[PDB]
Amino acid sequence: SIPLIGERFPEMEVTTDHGVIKLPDHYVSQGKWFVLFSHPADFTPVCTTEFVSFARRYEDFQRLGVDLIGLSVDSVFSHIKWKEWIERHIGVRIPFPIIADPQGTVARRLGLLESATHTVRGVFIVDARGVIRTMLYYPMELGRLVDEILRIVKALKLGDSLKRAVPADWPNNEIIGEGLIVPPPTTEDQARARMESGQYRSLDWWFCWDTPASRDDVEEARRYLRRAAEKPAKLLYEEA
Amino acid sequence: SIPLIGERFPEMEVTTDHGVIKLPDHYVSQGKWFVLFSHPADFTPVCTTEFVSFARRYEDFQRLGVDLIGLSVDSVFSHIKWKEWIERHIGVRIPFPIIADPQGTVARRLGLLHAESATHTVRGVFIVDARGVIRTMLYYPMELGRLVDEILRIVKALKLGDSLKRAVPADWPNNEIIGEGLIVPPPTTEDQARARMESGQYRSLDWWFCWDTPASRDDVEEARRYLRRAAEKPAKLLYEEA
Amino acid sequence: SIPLIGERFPEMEVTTDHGVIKLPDHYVSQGKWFVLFSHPADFTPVCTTEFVSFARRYEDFQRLGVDLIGLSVDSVFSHIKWKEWIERHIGVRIPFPIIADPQGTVARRLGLLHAESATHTVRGVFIVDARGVIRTMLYYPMELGRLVDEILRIVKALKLGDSLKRAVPADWPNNEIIGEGLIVPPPTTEDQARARMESGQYRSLDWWFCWDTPASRDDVEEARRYLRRAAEKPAKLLYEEA
Amino acid sequence: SIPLIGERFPEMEVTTDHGVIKLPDHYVSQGKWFVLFSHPADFTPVCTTEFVSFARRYEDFQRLGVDLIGLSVDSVFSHIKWKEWIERHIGVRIPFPIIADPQGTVARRLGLLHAESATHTVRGVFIVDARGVIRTMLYYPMELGRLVDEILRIVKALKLGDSLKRAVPADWPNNEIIGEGLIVPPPTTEDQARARMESGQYRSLDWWFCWDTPASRDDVEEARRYLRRAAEKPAKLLYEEA
Amino acid sequence: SIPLIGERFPEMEVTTDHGVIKLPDHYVSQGKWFVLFSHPADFTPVCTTEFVSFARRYEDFQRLGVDLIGLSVDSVFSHIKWKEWIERHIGVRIPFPIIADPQGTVARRLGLLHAESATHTVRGVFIVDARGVIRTMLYYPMELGRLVDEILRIVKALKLGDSLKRAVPADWPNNEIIGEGLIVPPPTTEDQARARMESGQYRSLDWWFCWDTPASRDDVEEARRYLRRAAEKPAKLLYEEA
Amino acid sequence: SIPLIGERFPEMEVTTDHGVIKLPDHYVSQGKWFVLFSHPADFTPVCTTEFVSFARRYEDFQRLGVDLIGLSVDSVFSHIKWKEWIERHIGVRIPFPIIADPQGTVARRLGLLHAESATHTVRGVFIVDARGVIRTMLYYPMELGRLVDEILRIVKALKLGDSLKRAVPADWPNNEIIGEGLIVPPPTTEDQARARMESGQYRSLDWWFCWDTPASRDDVEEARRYLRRAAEKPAKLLYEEA
Amino acid sequence: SIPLIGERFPEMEVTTDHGVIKLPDHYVSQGKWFVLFSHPADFTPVCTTEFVSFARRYEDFQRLGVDLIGLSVDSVFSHIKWKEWIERHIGVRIPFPIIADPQGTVARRLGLLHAESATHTVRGVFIVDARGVIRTMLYYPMELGRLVDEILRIVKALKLGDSLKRAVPADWPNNEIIGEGLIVPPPTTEDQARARMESGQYRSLDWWFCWDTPASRDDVEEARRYLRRAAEKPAKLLYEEA
Amino acid sequence: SIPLIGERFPEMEVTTDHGVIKLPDHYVSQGKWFVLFSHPADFTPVCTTEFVSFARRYEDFQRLGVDLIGLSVDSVFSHIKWKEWIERHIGVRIPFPIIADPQGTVARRLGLLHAESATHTVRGVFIVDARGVIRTMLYYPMELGRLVDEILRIVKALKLGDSLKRAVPADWPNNEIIGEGLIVPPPTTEDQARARMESGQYRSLDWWFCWDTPASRDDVEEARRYLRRAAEKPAKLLYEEA
């Protein structure tokens, strides 16, 4: 039992290590998207690599109007100690808030409870209207690929604005490359018409598409994926 | 009301365009993992890109010991025509079964009827392991096609963590901190934390953050192959090939 | 559990391959009867034969002021492909709408999920008059196509019964007792009965069995034409012509 | 709330003017099919036309292995008096049992209490096979006599499909596409589809639409004889001969 | 579970062979009493004998201002055919209405679905005054015809009790203690009892047993006429002169 | 919520002025029928006239194999005083038991608290056979004494009907159609109805109306005598001597 | 479940052998207390001795401003015969009302159906003040007559208690510690206990045990006259002189 | 909600100032009766007067085989301090046990929480026989001390009635009608009543009012001494000599 895609993020006050805030209102009222990602506990290695991975892509997220907020079943005092430790031993400052959810009240509300005591790694991509657009549930033992969350919100924003659907593997789809899909006709009249305009490349009346995204939108999406695939030049346990 | 990560795949008989099968027994019996991915409807363009994308990675999945299985609310007859259409117009044959779920009985049972459908299933993905246990769930929206290379990464990483008895860091195999590193599961008692620090037998940043590099050079280069492909601009689009 | 004869057609929005319509309002509005027929699935042979048969008889229904609407548990996109297929391989355009009912929400509301079904909807037929009231319901098995001419006979006889104030005998217009004669609703009181008999204004076998012949020759021969067609061996099959 | 197609006929004892019998057992145990037809009341003109029409086709049903049973909400005494009257004034003996259902316990168990109805039984027909299974249900209104030859066509065609393992096109034996051809149940797997098309043992318009012509000239002709009878003006009206 | 003596007759619309009427309103509105008798079924011998007996005493009822109304679980068409048979074969016209209660809605409302038959109403009588109040109820078994003269006596005696403020002793007007005398209602207080005995105005056996003879010689002899008729061997039986 | 005709008399222990007894067991065990009659209260005039009228007929009841038992909502000490009053002032010994029902437990079980009641028992009568089965119920108003000769006619006819296998016409032994004839219970199937007529073994008016005269002269005369005793003014009133 | 010391006597209408009255209203209206005593049945020996004992003390109760009302589960007609019997055979007029509680409505309302009954009301006494509040309840067994002189002592002492604001010692006016003294209600706070003691206005044994003698000599001698009378053998027994 | 006369005393373990005991078992086992009296609270004046009054009649209770047991909603430590107080200040040792009922558990169980308290127990008395059956209950208000001699008289009179199979008249042994006579329980059948009267075995006023004088002269004078003591002005107050 969870919230559903297309539903509005459930209304709640939450305590973070930045203060008390109202969700989704806090982000909606700033016209901001948010990514809520949860963690089973403070001072755990997979969750720390993820915090560091998100911090790294903080600017990338912000440039798309996306705020980040964590969730862990540990108090605010542990959250601040954990963060301090990250900055001192890894050298990276973790700039976004983390919800303190001892009791797992928030976790329960979101159905994030293998768990019993510690909260699955759930991720909710919520748009500027408060609406849940995506949910990823990775297991406790597996860290997220954070560059895929960036690709999602980028593709999603471009779909919402260009009035287009986004092909598998976009912007590198095998069939239509960086093309974007015109939502299929839903009546025979609409189908005939669309087939008679010849205004789109097409494979059938229900598969038409064009290339409306800017060159920079495509290269930015491709840049997320490129970074996901690169062998890191020098690791951060060395920097330490 | 969805099934839960770490629960057994709900026991059920399903009708596919390859016949009637029992989930998850049918894959467990073979000691196979399976990826179940749903689709709102046959003859829809995003969902057709995804089939094509899945069929391309079909051998990659086979190599890992993973089977593929679809789910659509359409009938088995639509599934077959849709697949015939893809093979004829795209030039790609779809090798894996599609559950025919008219009425949405299977979709319901899996909580795949979300708040933008009421009628067509969300893009749900269930990665179920050889023991028939759900290990990952992905819910993409209707308008957004999956990145199938990430599905492969997950199965690959989860099979490694499982075999090597490790946890897998963000962005593996390209984690900013420990690169190809895999993580030793943290001590949960005070003695165990002390023993672990005195053993000097792992690299480490703290007693709770220890790791080695126990993954074969081929295990790793294969994980990066997935991601590199995902990053590559296709040379030749299949639309032109038609 | 079902709609009932004499009941108003339940109010509902439905999505068809021609768009979203309101039942029964859309037809009541226009002063039209409608015949709603349900089909287990797209790209099935019996149900394709029936589509063709209703398309052939499309003008007959227009003359009667009857619109036709189909229902199948399959997405709108399948409905459209299925119609392209019939037009392309049989050479008959299907001009009427088909409700897309993935989930079987409409099918369920109408009680069209029966015990040989579970997945796909019974072959159900609702004959609904211009007032939105159900007048006849037919439930044929999934393996047996309908006799479309009988649906025509029913509407025509019922409209004749409504307007002439008459009940229609078995097998009309070929009843073995009274041929094309129409029945006067029987008296429900003893004084009514006694008056009917003394009036001698009707042919009669008893006070409860009185009839006359008020249908025009045209009405009679139009109704017989439907059964005559149904009886005729076709003079050229569409299979060959294909 | 009704019995459903594919559902077993509800187990019940009924009283008729032939005696008390158990349904569907009484007929199952003889290897008989049966048609149960319900009537609003005794001594009503539409229902008398229907009884005479069934009685007239009595031997046709018997040759098909099909028994007839009526159901009216009136006592067994009224039934016999009613039958006696039909035999005296119309000259036709009604050879089959009629259920006496005062109280409407049976009507109610069967859902034959509709919304024009109140107290008198909808005009419902159940065609039940020799396994005791409901195969077809027809609901005509109070004011419209049934077409009894369509009932014979139905059981004839269902018996044919059952024994030949075939589906039956619309308007059989005069279907516009395939005439008197019967349909091969479509393939439900990709492998069956491909194999069906490789075999080349059937006429087909597609892998899901294959048929042949396995019905005997006699069976086809018998079916056409039912429809020709329904279509032709009778020579001699039983009222003239009163 | 039944309505009760002292209670108002249950409000209800009913259909009879003379029309639709509201009970007890149709009768109260005329300032008339009514006797409602019920009958298991039409075309039954005991029940026919009863109808004939009531028809014979019809004017005796009208002299008392009492209308008769029957009830049988059988349709209006059967009732009329049943009446028709009686007039034809026995020579007696049944002038009063009969409720057609197919389904037994009225029967259940009145508790007339007793144990000998869950299908045909017990043989019950409700005697109902001009205020719509139930004054008497009789339940005979289905095998035993009523004594209609005793119903006349009850109405007559009860109209007298009411109009004279008197109670009626056993066997009136032939009581073995006081003959045709009528009983003064007993005092309910010690002061009334004392006053009654000091007044010396009645014949008395005790303060609680007082009586006088206030009924006209006509009232008394009318009541005794009923008992005498019941006691008389009939002159000429109706079967003979059929 | 009354007991019902055809039902077993509800099991119960009761206290009478003759002792405690189990109903209907006390009478079933003796092979006896019984008449249970209820009374609103002790020391009341109508109920005193009934007790006397029943006492007069005690021997008529014993000869039929029938016991009498009263019921009143008053203690056993009232019953005995009341009886002693009747015997001292009227000169009639009341031989039968009266149930003492203070609290009205028995009265509620039998549903005898009717609308005029609340506190005093409706005046009801149950005629119960030697199987414990309720065969008749009369409900007379508080103000109207019963006619005891009619209760003796009912059991006499019920017994003859039970043993001869016959139904009893209205007003028996003086029915206007058939006099002292008894009715052969009607056929319930066409075959029975045909055989009955074929046989020609009975007087008849129709297949559903056959009768004969198998009751003895004595049975007939005993029953006519009850009716005669009801009809005649008694020579000598008891208040005279009393 | 019963009424309670300190609760209002339950609101109710009751039928007595003097007429219908409202309790406690009827006595409350007059500024009177009343004693209600119940009796299991009329024409019972203990309960007669009681009536007689209360009758003898009727003037004593009147002087106190107290009415008496009896209660018996027997009809009003029995009450009156019983009372007549007492006046006639014993020579004493029972001047006060008796409630006729047939069915025991009043008895259930008051909880007087105890275990040794189901049928007959316990021997219970309610003493109710002029405000309608129950002050005392006594429940004697059916086999033990009350001591009516103790009931007078209770109300006389309760009247002194209420008007003098005093509590009444055991066995008053003959208490072993303080004789005819009356008890000052004890202090409930420490300040109150010190105050009472330092003011030295009462005889005392402790701060919680103070008393005085505020009752007049006539009040005292009156209360003691009830008890003397209870103790003395009557100079004349009523049975001898009967 | 109290226990009821006739019902066995509710089984229970209680703590008293003499130890823990099971009720009624502890006294039943000894063949003793017990009187259980309740007190709202320790160190209250009316309740102290009563304790003393009981302590005074202690051997009178022993002579009858009756034990005494008090009950108060106060700890066992208060009970004992209260007893010491009475012994020290009044000179009277209280020999019987008092139940300590802090919380009111026993009191609730026995319905001893009435509507003038909710905190402190009503002043209730239960007289319980050697078989553990409740024979008498008395409820005085709190402001009114009991009359302990009336309690001795009840138990003495009850034990005599029991042993002699007699009922005891009002005011016994000083009944106005029959003096010290005891009542023969009344006959409950007509046979008993007639036999009783035929025997001339008793003095009688009627068949239901018979008596004799079976009590020994010592039983009679012992009972009357109880009452004489209650009527005697005390020759020396306990407070003076305190």
The nearest CA of chain E is from the CA of D119 a distance in Å of: 6
What type of residue is D65? G
- Other beta carbons within 10 angstroms of residue G185's beta carbon come to 16
Size of interface C-E (CB pairs under 8 A): 19
Smallest Cβ–Cβ distance between E186 and the set G16, G77, G83 belongs to G77
Q: List the structure tokens of G155.
A: 């109300």
Question: Are residues F17 and H207, on separate chains, in Cβ contact within 8 Å?
Answer: no
Q: List the structure tokens of H119.
A: 């905190």
From D127, D129, D99, select the one nearest D38 (Cα to Cα).
D99
Residue F103, C-beta contacts closer than 8 angstroms, at least 6 positions apart: F73, G73, G103, G104, G113, G118, G119
Which part of chain D is CATH 3.40.30.10? 1-143
Size of interface E-F (CB pairs under 8 A): 259
- Chosen from F112, F116, F119 to mutate, greatest number of chain G CBs within 10 A: F119
Q: Do chains C and B touch (3 or more CB pairs under 8 A)?
A: yes
Cα(C48)–Cα(C53) distance, integer angstroms: 9
Question: Are residues G17 and E207, on separate chains, in Cβ contact within 8 Å?
Answer: no
User: What technique solved it?
Assistant: X-ray
Chain E residues near residue C189 by CB distance under 8 angstroms? 17-19, 76
From E234, E12, E230, select the one nearest E107 (Cα to Cα).
E12
The nearest CA of chain C is from the CA of A186 a distance in Å of: 6
What type of residue is G134? I
Scanning the structure block, which residue is given the tokens 């138990």? Answer: H155
Under 8 Å between Cβ of F50 and F151: no
Q: Do chains F and B touch (3 or more CB pairs under 8 A)?
A: no
What type of residue is H148? V
Q: Do chains G and E touch (3 or more CB pairs under 8 A)?
A: yes
Smallest Cβ–Cβ distance between G73 and the set F103, F113, F120 belongs to F103
Question: Are residues E119 and D104, on separate chains, in Cβ contact within 8 Å?
Answer: no
Cα(F59)–Cα(D238) distance, integer angstroms: 66
Scanning the structure block, which residue is given the tokens 């021609």? Answer: C18
Q: For residue C160, give Cα distances in angstroms to A220, D144, E213.
A: 72, 10, 71
E25: Cα separation from own chain's centroid: 18
Fold of B1-143: Glutaredoxin (3.40.30)
Beta strands E209-212; E182-184: pairing state:
antiparallel
Q: Judge: domain A142-240, CATH 3.30.428.10.
A: no
Question: Are residues C43 and B15, on separate chains, in Cβ contact within 8 Å?
Answer: no
Structural Rg of chain G based on CA atoms: 20
3-class secondary structure, F16: strand
The nearest CA of chain A is from the CA of C215 a distance in Å of: 41
Cα(G186)–Cα(G191) distance, integer angstroms: 12
User: In the complex, which subunits touch D with 3 or more CB pairs below 8 angstroms?
Assistant: B, C, E, F
Beta strands in B85-183 (DSSP E): 98-100, 123-128, 134-140, 182-183
From D179, E179, B212, A140, select the one nearest D168 (Cα to Cα).
D179
Q: List the structure tokens of A174.
A: 């095998």
Question: Are residues F80 and H208, on separate chains, in Cβ contact within 8 Å?
Answer: yes
From H95, H112, H110, select the one nearest H39 (Cα to Cα).
H112
Instruction: Give burial (CB, 10 Å; 0-12/13-18/19+) of C164.
Output: middle
The nearest CA of chain B is from the CA of C82 a distance in Å of: 9
Cα(E48)–Cα(E89) distance, integer angstroms: 11
Chain H residues near residue F77 by CB distance under 8 angstroms? 186, 208
Chain G residues near residue E208 by CB distance under 8 angstroms? 77, 80-81
Q: Which residue of C has its CA nearest to E95?
A: C190
Chain F residues near residue G105 by CB distance under 8 angstroms? 119
Q: Which residue of D has its CA nearest to C135?
A: D141
Under 8 Å between Cβ of E55 and E95: yes
From D123, D158, D149, D117, select the one nearest D138 (Cα to Cα).
D123
Which part of chain D is CATH 3.30.1020.10? 144-242
Smallest Cβ–Cβ distance between C122 and the set D5, D178, D242 belongs to D5
Q: Do chains G and A touch (3 or more CB pairs under 8 A)?
A: no
From D127, D169, D133, select the one nearest D148 (Cα to Cα).
D127
Element (H, E) at E128: strand E123-128
Element (H, E) at A181: strand A180-182
F237: Cα separation from own chain's centroid: 25
Structural Rg of chain E based on CA atoms: 20
Chain B residues near residue A206 by CB distance under 8 angstroms? 43-45
Q: List the structure tokens of H81.
A: 């301090």
- Chosen from E21, E74, E79, E80 to mutate, greatest number of chain C CBs within 10 A: E80
The single residue of A35, A47, A182, A208 carrying the catalytic annotation is A47
The nearest CA of chain A is from the CA of C96 a distance in Å of: 11
- Chosen from B14, B15, B17 to mutate, greatest number of chain D CBs within 10 A: B17
The nearest CA of chain A is from the CA of B98 a distance in Å of: 18
On whether F224 is known to bind a ligand per the annotation, the reply is: no
Structural Rg of chain F based on CA atoms: 20
Smallest Cβ–Cβ distance between E237 and the set F138, F153, F178 belongs to F178
Question: Are residues G171 and H147, on separate chains, in Cβ contact within 8 Å?
Answer: yes
Phi, psi of G140 (to 5 degrees): -90, 155
Q: List the structure tokens of H168.
A: 């005891």
The catalytic site residues of G sit at 47
Q: Judge: domain H144-242, CATH 3.40.50.720.
A: no
The maximal CA–CA distance of chain C, rounded, in angstroms, is 65
The nearest CA of chain A is from the CA of C161 a distance in Å of: 38
What type of residue is G189? T
3-class secondary structure, H84: helix
Cα(H149)–Cα(G230) distance, integer angstroms: 11
> How far is the first Cα of chain C from the last one, in angstroms, to the nearest whole number?
42
Smallest Cβ–Cβ distance between B167 and the set A135, A141, A184 belongs to A141
Question: Are residues E190 and G83, on separate chains, in Cβ contact within 8 Å?
Answer: yes
- Other beta carbons within 10 angstroms of residue A97's beta carbon come to 21
Per CB distance under 8 Å, which residues of G are interface residues toward E? 15-19, 76-77, 80-81, 83
Per CB distance under 8 Å, which residues of F are interface residues toward G? 15, 40-44, 73-78, 80-81, 100, 102-105, 107, 113, 118-120
Residue F47 a catalytic site member: yes
Q: Which residue of A has its CA nearest to B1?
A: A1
The catalytic site residues of H sit at 47
A1-141 — its CATH code? Answer: 3.40.30.10
From G134, G203, G207, select the one nearest G175 (Cα to Cα).
G203
Question: Are residues B15 and D191, on separate chains, in Cβ contact within 8 Å?
Answer: no
Question: Are residues D17 and F186, on separate chains, in Cβ contact within 8 Å?
Answer: no
DSSP state of E8: B
From G209, F143, G30, A156, select the one nearest H242 (Cα to Cα).
G209
Per CB distance under 8 Å, which residues of G are interface residues toward F? 15, 40-44, 73-75, 77-78, 80-81, 102-105, 113, 118-120
G117: Cα separation from own chain's centroid: 23
Residue C172, C-beta contacts closer than 8 angstroms, at least 6 positions apart: C153, C157, C180, C182, C223, D145
Q: Is the backbone of residue E53 left (phi > 0), alpha (psi -120 to 50) or beta?
A: alpha
The single residue of E47, E92, E110, E113 carrying the catalytic annotation is E47
- Other beta carbons within 10 angstroms of residue E199's beta carbon come to 10
Q: Is the backbone of residue D140 left (phi > 0), alpha (psi -120 to 50) or beta?
A: beta
User: In the complex, which subunits touch H with 3 or more CB pairs below 8 angstroms?
Assistant: F, G
Smallest Cβ–Cβ distance between A89 and the set B4, B186, B205 belongs to B205
Which part of chain A is CATH 3.30.1020.10? 142-240
F66: which strand partners?
F33
